[PDB]
Amino acid sequence: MINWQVIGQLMSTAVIMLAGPAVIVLLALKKGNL
Amino acid sequence: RLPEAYVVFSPIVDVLPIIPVFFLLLAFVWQAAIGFR
Amino acid sequence: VSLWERFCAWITSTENRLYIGWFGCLMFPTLLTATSCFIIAFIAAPPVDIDGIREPVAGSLLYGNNIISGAVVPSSNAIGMHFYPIWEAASIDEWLYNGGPYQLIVLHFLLGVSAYMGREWELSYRLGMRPWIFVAFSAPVAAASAVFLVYPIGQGSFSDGMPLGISGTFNFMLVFQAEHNILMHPFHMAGVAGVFGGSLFSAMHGSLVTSSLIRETTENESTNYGYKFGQEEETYNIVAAHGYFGRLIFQYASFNNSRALHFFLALWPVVGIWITSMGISTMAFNLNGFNFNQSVVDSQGRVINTWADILNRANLGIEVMHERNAHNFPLDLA
Amino acid sequence: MITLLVALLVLISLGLVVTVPVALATPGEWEIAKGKFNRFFQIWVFLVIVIAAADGISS
Amino acid sequence: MEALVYTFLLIGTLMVIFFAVFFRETPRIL
């Protein structure tokens, strides 16, 4: 009884909300064509 | 809910319609990192 | 040489006193018929069954009214959304009883205003102007079509449409409050911010120009005569008004660019009235504003009142009293 | 087995989206290495058919 | 008798709108 749904949702937004700027951050370090 | 072979991924699916809003914000983040040029 | 080319040359001539244009071909016949019927229906028009219950509501000056109470009454509840012209009425007396001239005025109004808007485009094309004054005029056209056209559609009758008058306007606003809760709806909130903000930046821009005028007159004559028409010199020190507002709040909140300044004066109201006129539109289809009634409870479960509960008891007073005879069943579905 | 393969299908699409626009926005990374990446597309498409097979068998 | 005043105020207002549009002081350069 540890509320697996909310733990699942808050991690899965934080995976996806951090997978977007990581596309840009990996390009800024690489100095590619932004 | 989802079929029984897919009840596991019920948290991930709940996030999925939000993701098209995140492409609108991805443009501005990309314009910030390019320096708005 | 041809008769049509000599007519197209006249109707698109900017050398006329008033530019007619191709939109004036259906602006001027529409708005003169909306006008000439409005003046007659406001002055001399018999009472109108609005509730469909054969209780005729007087609205004209000859039947004992004034400027404030007199109004062109909307059409009947018996008609509702049906198109009711003069030729589908079997007499003019049957036409004027059932709310005839409300549909003749409104439908010739919305065609003439949507043609007055396209006429503002057309002359901007023939004068070399950049075109978009008519986009700024879309904001009252959105709001005129919201209370005369869209709200009678979603409510299913022109009788819920706005009465063409002054006291009829406040009958419209209060009944719209009880049935839809417009004040809690965030699109009336986004246009109160549009016209409070609009009247702010109007009187804030108009003061900083008038503050920084250059000496061109004496103290005996008027301030305004230091501007000769068509001159090429700038009539106010814009660096002066920038340094004033740059100290009145702080430095970085001031537009040094006068073009971006004169764009923000056009953005803020017009966006505020586009959003507001799509508040009436989404509340025409009974998607009402917020409802926080009985939202705060104690641990026992008793309802603790809020300001929305006091606002609710004002809405319940108008709801139980609007159209006090037209209802027969416990819920105002219309 | 469907819950194991779809979980393997999501983890690959995590691995692609982090790496594929990085492989394209770089001036040469896609031309220098795409036969590495073209396997991962062919693996990814192959999983969709395996899951569509295992769903029809199980129903 | 009362509404006669209201009508005179309305059409009297539309007169000065007519004169302001057509008999306006036309502005001139130079």
Add this chain to the structure above:
Amino acid sequence: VWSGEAYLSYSLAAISLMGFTAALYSWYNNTAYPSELYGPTGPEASQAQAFTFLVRDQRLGANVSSAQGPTGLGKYLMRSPSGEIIFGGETMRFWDLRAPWVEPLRGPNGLDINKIKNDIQPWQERRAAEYMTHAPLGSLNSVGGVATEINSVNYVS
């Protein structure tokens, strides 16, 4: 104008035509949008109320045809401005409501009084009571009912 942006402003005029029309299908049409799926329409929930209290007071032995309304019109059954027998109230504006649970009670003239006095089927009573309580009247915080309804239901159509 044969240019790039001009073709884009040709589409945006036509897509707005389709935009209003799909937004007016969803309010009135109960054929492409069945009331069993999308809920009752604006017009349909106004007629389902007047039909429910028609059934309610018919069980009290009341002649509903001759039941004189408070305004002098029909309290239950009145006559449309084209001559048809319709429901009365503020629901007289939606007298064009053609719905699969009321069309069993039609005739040439309209609502057949003989068929109302005798043939009302209990699935129509279960339907008009369902479409009264789930009328398309809501709020942005998704509480149903009228604008002055208390916060207990969670429904916007």
Add this chain to the structure above:
Amino acid sequence: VIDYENIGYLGGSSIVDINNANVRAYLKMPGMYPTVAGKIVSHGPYSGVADLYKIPGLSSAEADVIKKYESRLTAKTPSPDYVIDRINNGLYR
């Protein structure tokens, strides 16, 4: 009417009128709403509680709940504006 006598016998005095009360007034009597109360309201003017037994279509059970409350039922002068809105007078809880 400004000054109408027998306002009390309509709904609230707990001694009801017959030919003027709403059908909601018979709700306070257990057993009569809706069936037995439906027949009383539907038919025409009554002169007494004895005329309640003259209703066409009464059972012994329908006369039973009238026999219980026959002290509380009483009949008055029918004023014709109250006699119309006896099924529905536009009052809803």
Add this chain to the structure above:
Amino acid sequence: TEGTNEWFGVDDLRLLAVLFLGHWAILSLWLGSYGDSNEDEDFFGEIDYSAR
């Protein structure tokens, strides 16, 4: 008869002869200048300034 499903509100036959003689009476004016022109003359502009 209002709610009849008739084309353009044409109830009687007489209203057609009104419609046809309205579009055509201005069409014939329009063909007096823009009609009887070359239907085979092109341009690679965005906008044509051909003739009157």
Add this chain to the structure above:
Amino acid sequence: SYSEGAAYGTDQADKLYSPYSVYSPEGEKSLYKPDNAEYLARKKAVLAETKNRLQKIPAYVDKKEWFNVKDELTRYMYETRGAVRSLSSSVTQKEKAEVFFRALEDTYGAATLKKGDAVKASNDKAIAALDAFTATL
């Protein structure tokens, strides 16, 4: 806790159908048992009256009243499709029902087009088709 909104499963003791629901599943300890005879007797009773509502069809086609034949098969007969689909359990019982429907949809398709024989022909294709349904199961 009393005002916790996103307590999906820690609140209640019984297992729910889904975290996004309030109701428990269709398993044990329910009060609705679909094997009961009064549910079967309700569905059987509408099948019996359907034939009785369908024999009144030619009386309106012998007359001129087409508005009464378009709705007689929707006024009472609305509850048919809910029952005859529910009574159809076995294999060949199921594909017997669409014989009855397609024969019934042509009665309504001919009543709107006002064809007198096509109603009377397809009515007899319906009484014979419900005869096939009721006699088997």
Add this chain to the structure above:
Amino acid sequence: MLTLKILVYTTVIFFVSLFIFGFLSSDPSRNPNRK
């Protein structure tokens, strides 16, 4: 009442046809730039 009705469809499609055949009259070329 069917005599008035005839008069309206004259007046509508008179001005609607002036609108329709106004913009077909080479209307983009009527600018202060050229011609």
Add this chain to the structure above:
Amino acid sequence: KSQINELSYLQVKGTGLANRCAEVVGEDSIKPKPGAKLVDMCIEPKAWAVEEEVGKAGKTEKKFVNSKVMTRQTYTLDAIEGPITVDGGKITFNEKEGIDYAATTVQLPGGERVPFLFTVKDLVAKGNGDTFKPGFQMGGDFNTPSYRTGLFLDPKGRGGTTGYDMAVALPALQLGEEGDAELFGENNKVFDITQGRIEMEVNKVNAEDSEIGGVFVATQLSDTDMGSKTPKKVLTKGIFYAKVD
């Protein structure tokens, strides 16, 4: 007719046909049975007339001027039931149920709007002989109820069974011993019942179809708004139609 029953609903609506009573064809006799009950009596008036003071050459005797109806197509009565009882000398009719009122409003010369409830409530018809004939002619009294049920609220908010009972925005009228008794008549709302006399006349019968129909003439009294004005005598004429069963 049966010709009206041929049509569907979508073909009748918007055409103004449901307002109009049927046309019976042919003439013969039909006999009312012992349990005979009248089924589909519809009444529709085709002309209206209000008794006024008419401007003749030199005289002002009361005459009927006609009037134009302004409520559109809502005047016809329909579905009126009732048993046909057989008295020995004369066949009688007493109506029981059906839509037996249709509120409407006509306009006079001068611009005066006179509403009136057109009704046949509690009708006791009596006609010569027993069987319905083309020479048959029955009529009798009907009771007109008031045009407004007593819970109607006037513009100030005053009704017979609800509302206030004083001029609600004139609070200084109820001062003194006299009170507001000068405007007493506009506070007391009185439900009014008057009488009306209809005279029907059968002239065309089917016996193979058991449906009759002919011309009537009805006179009644217009409304008063619960004692607000003097009501005026309203005459009307038209055609009816009935199914004798």
Add this chain to the structure above:
Amino acid sequence: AYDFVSQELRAAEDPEFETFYTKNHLLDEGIRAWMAAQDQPHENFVFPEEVLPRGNAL
């Protein structure tokens, strides 16, 4: 500016004369009666149910 007395004296003597203006007074009786019980708890307005102006069937 509460009332036009020429509108109010006429609507009292003629119980058929209705404008939009007299329609706004009945909307204000609903505001003056329904909210004033909960508006002003210091004054202790205890209204009965039978004095509150309701319309027909609302």
Add this chain to the structure above:
Amino acid sequence: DLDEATRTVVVDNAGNTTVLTPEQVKRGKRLFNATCGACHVGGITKTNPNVGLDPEALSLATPRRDNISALVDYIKNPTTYDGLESIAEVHPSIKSADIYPRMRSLTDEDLYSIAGHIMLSPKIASEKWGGGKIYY
């Protein structure tokens, strides 16, 4: 401040009183708004306003309906207000639960908490429950 004296509600026709555990009052609200509250919101009945959920109106029914055991009796077998005939065909019930899809999954404790909510709500809000819009 949900004291156990306030949670103590009457349970049988004789008059015994038992208490409701705090999950009964919480599931009792969620189930009532989801199932019953479409028409019985706040104690009034939308489709028949004469027959409410008032503690006065439940008591005047010909079987007395104030008890928890009397309310769950009504849910499985709804008679009329005078209790002569059944209206299970039109009111949602357990007996006629093939037509209503909303009541195919309800246990005994679920109706015990819904009827708990109908009984314990006049004790919390004395006049708001079934008082109409006057007492909103």
